[PDB]
Amino acid sequence: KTIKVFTTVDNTNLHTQLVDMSMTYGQQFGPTYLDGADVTKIKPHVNHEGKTFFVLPSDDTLRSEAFEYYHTLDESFLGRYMSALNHTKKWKFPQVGGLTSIKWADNNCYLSSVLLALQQLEVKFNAPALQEAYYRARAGDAANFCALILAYSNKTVGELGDVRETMTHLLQHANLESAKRVLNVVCKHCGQKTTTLTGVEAVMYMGTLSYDNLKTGVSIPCVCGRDATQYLVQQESSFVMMSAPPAEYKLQQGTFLCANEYTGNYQCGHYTHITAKETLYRIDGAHLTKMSEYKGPVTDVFYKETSYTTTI
Numbered sequence: 001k002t003i004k005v006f007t008t009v010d011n012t013n014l015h016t017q018l019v020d021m022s023m024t025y026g027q028q029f030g031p032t033y034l035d036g037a038d039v040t041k042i043k044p045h046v047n048h049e050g051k052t053f054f055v056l057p058s059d060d061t062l063r064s065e066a067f068e069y070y071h072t073l074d075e076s077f078l079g080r081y082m083s084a085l086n087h088t089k090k091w092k093f094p095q096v097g098g099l100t101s102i103k104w105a106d107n108n109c110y111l112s113s114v115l116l117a118l119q120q121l122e123v124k125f126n127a128p129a130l131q132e133a134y135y136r137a138r139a140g141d142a143a144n145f146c147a148l149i150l151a152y153s154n155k156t157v158g159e160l161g162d163v164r165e166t167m168t169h170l171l172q173h174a175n176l177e178s179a180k181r182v183l184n185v186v187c188k189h190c191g192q193k194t195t196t197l198t199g200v201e202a203v204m205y206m207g208t209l210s211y212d213n214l215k216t217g218v219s220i221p222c223v224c225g226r227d228a229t230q231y232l233v234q235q236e237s238s239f240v241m242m243s244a245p246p247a248e249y250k251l252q253q254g255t256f257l258c259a260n261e262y263t264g265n266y267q268c269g270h271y272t273h274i275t276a277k278e279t280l281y282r283i284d285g286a287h288l289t290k291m292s293e294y295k296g297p298v299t300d301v302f303y304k305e306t307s308y309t310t311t312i
């Protein structure tokens with residue numbers, strides 16, 4: 001018997017295929033799904049006629065389309081994306097404080113913090129799978145975006161994860177092509193030195209939560225002797241992300257865009273997100289509390305930027 005169905009790896013280009021009556025889908029299409037339903041080992045029915053199956057890039061056309069959509073060559077990627085989607089599609093995405101958040105499940109609080117921060121930054125993704133899923137996320141349909149974050153970060157539903165590390169992976173697919181950071185390492189003796197950073201390191205800094213501190217000078221146990229200071233001479237980007245091991249830190253209105261706090265120890269703990277609106281909002285998955293000032297164990301802080309150049 002002859003039956004007509006569609007395959008795809010990007011949900012955008014569908015390919016008409018003629019499936020054989022007898023055999024299942026795995027020895028015909030390889031690994032195959034149908035609405036997150038691993039029917040690789042399931043025989044073809046007849047209500048199938050006309051419907052669309054996901055598959056793995058078996059041939060040059062599918063591999064090229066997968067690459068164009070996802071911007072990865074990783075052969076495990078699509079399977080990993082699928083098994084995450086099975087779960088994330090069961091998560092809830094309420095609107096909290098004007099933003100799409102995520103109701104706690106499967107230690108997804110780090111993901112909620114990543115999702116909340118991104119919505120407040122002037123940032124776009126170059127990979128079409130990310131830009132499309134993100135558009136939908138901002139509108140409350142975030143299951144796909146979350147599964148994609150997991151897949152790009154090499155993380156699995158149910159693991160706790162680190163927000164900074166996650167952003168490190170995601171921002172490699174962000175519109176950073178024009179971002180630029182110039183730092184100066186100065187010394188009492190040693191000498192004078194300038195460093196230019198681009199891509200991810202133009203916007204991500206690890207070692208202080210304070211953007212002011214990076215502007216006035218941050219100190220470090222030097223390589224030739226005593227006390228090197230690092231100071232920002234120039235910044236070109238729409239935001240910066242300052243991270244540090246969690247530490248007691250006061251967040252005041254009008255001084256930052258948003259932040260993550262982390263309570264617990266390295267192995268096990270809990271993130272919440274703080275954003276500065278008419279007052280401070282602390283968004284803890286589905287829950288909201290409000291406060292005029294916060295002091296607690298902050299670990300990332302986001303600040304708005306356009307262009308900065310130094311006075312030193």
Ligand SMILES: C[C@H](c1cccc2ccccc12)N1CCC(C(=O)NCc2cccc(F)c2)CC1
Nearest residue numbers: 160161162163244245246262265266267268299
């Ligand atoms: C922000 C926080 C963090 C980031 C950077 C330095 C830290 C030092 C002490 C405590 C926390 C620190 N960070 C948050 C997420 C954490 C995480 O992913 N834990 C999962 C895990 C599970 C099992 C073992 C393990 F080491 C870690 C890993 C650490």
Ligand SMILES: [Zn+2]
Nearest residue numbers: 187190222224
């Ligand atoms: Zn030096």
